[PDB]
Homo-oligomer: A and B are copies of this chain.
Amino acid sequence: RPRFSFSIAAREGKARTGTIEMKRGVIRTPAFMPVGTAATVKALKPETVRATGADIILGNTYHLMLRPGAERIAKLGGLHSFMGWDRPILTDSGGYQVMSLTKQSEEGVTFMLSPERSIEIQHLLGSDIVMAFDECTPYPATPSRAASSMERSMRWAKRSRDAFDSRKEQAENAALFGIQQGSVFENLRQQSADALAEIGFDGYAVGGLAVGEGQDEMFRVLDFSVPMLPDDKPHYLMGVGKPDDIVGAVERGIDMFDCVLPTRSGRNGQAFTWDGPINIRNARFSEDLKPLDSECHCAVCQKWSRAYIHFLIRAGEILGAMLMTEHNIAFYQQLMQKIRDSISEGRFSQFAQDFRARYFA
């Protein structure tokens, strides 16, 4: 396989379906990436992650650069070998969780994580898709602060590009994505898109939109922001999201997604179904012998009842977290498969309407 090749096989409106071919595997798009917060997708063996249909996972960098440390993971053979996942891994830059979980300057953030150090950490982990180091502008932001933040991020995008390219093994085997910023402002989104395309990246993320602005506003910003990106490269909406967010983002040209919702909320008792989410802890499930979802093909829904999973979660049992997480990730992957197939068949608009009618009934 090549280092990186994105091919679009079918289109419907702004929606696209296709593949990204990388050295460690093929990624079917639109793609959902389960999140590994600290070298594990919580409560799942990697073979179970793969069994749900995931082609690629997102590895957070922030925790690993603190413990065990990027150099130690490299010494142990890289993140893939360490955690036992041999397919592509996309790593974030570590900057976002540095702020959320500090002194910012033009050189980077002290808490020193510079663009150069972020790229190096992602190299030491052995990332397949490296994210440029930037700032996720807070929401809401004044136009002046959004502009200042975006402009710095574009300077850091060039520094990220140059650091990536300076390291032969990384440039030849990994890919690099740039991140569009600009808050909710069309002119800043355009300037950011232009700056990133001038630098040149393997894919383009839409950053700064998983920030509490609400779906209407997110969709409004995507409406004008995604067309600004190069059409022939993947479009990655970072940190999104709920099932209906994903469907509407695909309708607007997004190819890649990640979020902790299916894993984190799964451990908290929320199960996704085609009839909307349910909280399995609710007393109404105490004697419900049906599976979590009536159509889901996952191993959890083949074998165990709502009643049992209700009992496990209310008991705090580890198997409850395991089963909820496997189902939720499998549900997300089945959603992505239905999206891909419906685009391929030119019936995605109908699928989106049917999905929403039943999910929000």
Contacts and interface: CB of A to CB of B under 8 A. Distances in A.
Interface string A252-263: 000000000000
A98 interface: no
Q: Which of A42, A75, A308, A321 has the most CB of B within 10 A?
A: A308
A123 B240 CA distance: 49
A43 B42 CA distance: 13
A44 B319 contact: yes
A42 B314 CA distance: 14
Nearest to A82: B308
A308 B42 contact: no
A317 B315 CA distance: 18
Interface string A281-319: 000001101000000000000011101100110110111
A63 B311 CA distance: 12
Nearest to A40: B319
A12 to B, nearest CB: 39
B68 A286 contact: yes
Given A82-B307, A307-B76, A311-B68, A318 B287 contact: no
Interface in A63-91: 63, 67-68, 72, 75-77, 82-84
A197 interface: no
Contact of A76 (B63, B72, B82, B289): B289
Nearest to A326: B45
Contacts of A304: 84
A312 B76 CA distance: 15
Interface string A196-240: 000000000000000000000000000000000000000000000
15 contacts: A40-B318, A40-B319, A43-B319, A67-B311, A67-B314, A68-B307, A68-B311, A72-B287, A76-B289, A76-B305, A82-B305, A82-B311, A84-B303, A318-B322, A322-B322
A-B complex: 9 closest residue pairs judged by Cβ atoms: A43-B318, A40-B319, A40-B317, A84-B303, A82-B308, A76-B307, A68-B311, A318-B318, A318-B321
Interface of A: 38-40, 42-45, 63, 67-68, 72, 75-77, 82-84, 286-287, 289, 303-305, 307-308, 311-312, 314-315, 317-319, 321-322
